[PDB]
Amino acid sequence: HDPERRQRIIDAAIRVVGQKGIAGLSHRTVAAEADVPLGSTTYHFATLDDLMVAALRQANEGFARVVAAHPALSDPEADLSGELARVLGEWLGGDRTGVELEYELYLAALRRPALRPVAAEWAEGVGALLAARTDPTTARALVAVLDGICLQVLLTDTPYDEEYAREVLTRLI
């Protein structure tokens, strides 16, 4: 263990990615942005994948916090659809650097097998909140659809339509 030097490094990885993107993520630049010695970076994350895996892992940590601040998601007395659409609305609107950053790391799992189990983590922990309410097959669905709705906004560059989102989300539950 060496939490802080390690922790500073991860934060700088996230900072480097959001700024220059996955392409601008090397040990020298993380070392620089973290302002720690190059050897400390190669010591804690031998490979770049290790570093990305830890970064994404941390980005996921934040979704949980968001679910924690919005009790309606756990209140089996509230409209899951309308409530989810809303949270997404808030996440999507309000600095895409955080959004793009997290998504870039996540989508990176497509080619880098290392990131797949950490990608799967996100999903298994998100359907968790939906599976705790509805059945498991509807959870697996929601997590999937929900992803496609964000991607549809982030990729096509067409604004987020909360009502549409709530309707399509409703068709699954």
Chain residues in the site for a second copy (CB under 8 A): 21, 23, 100, 103-104, 106-107, 109-111, 113, 115-117, 119-120, 123, 137, 140-141, 143-149, 151-152, 154-158, 164, 167-168, 171-172
Q: How many residues bind to ligand PRL according to rule CB under 6 A?
A: 12
Length of the chain: 173
The site for Ni ion (CB under 5 A) is made up of: 90
- Could you tell me the sign of the dihedral formed by the alpha carbons of 32, 35, 40, 41, in that order? negative
What CA–CA distance (Å, rounded) separates 34 from 30? Answer: 6
End-to-end CA distance of the chain: 44
Closest distance to ligand PRL from the beta carbon of 40 (Å): 29
Closest distance to a second copy from the beta carbon of 7 (Å): 26
Amino acid type, 152? Q
Q: Out of a second copy, Ni ion, ligand PRL, none, which partner does residue 171 contact, by CB within 5 to 8 A per kind? A: a second copy
Q: Out of ligand PRL, Ni ion, a second copy, none, which partner does residue 144 contact, by CB within 5 to 8 A per kind? A: a second copy
User: Which secondary-structure segment (H or E) carries 21?
Assistant: none
Asked if residue 160 binds ligand PRL (CB under 6 A), the reply is no
User: Which secondary-structure segment (H or E) carries 137?
Assistant: helix 136-156
Q: Which residue has the tokens 């497509």?
A: 110
Of 4 and 156, which has the nearer Cβ to a second copy? 156
Of 1 and 156, which has the nearer Cβ to a second copy? 156
Structure tokens at 77: 């007395």
Closest distance to ligand PRL from the beta carbon of 115 (Å): 12
Amino acid type, 166? R
Of 17 and 36, which has the nearer Cβ to a second copy? 17
What CA–CA distance (Å, rounded) separates 14 from 102? Answer: 8
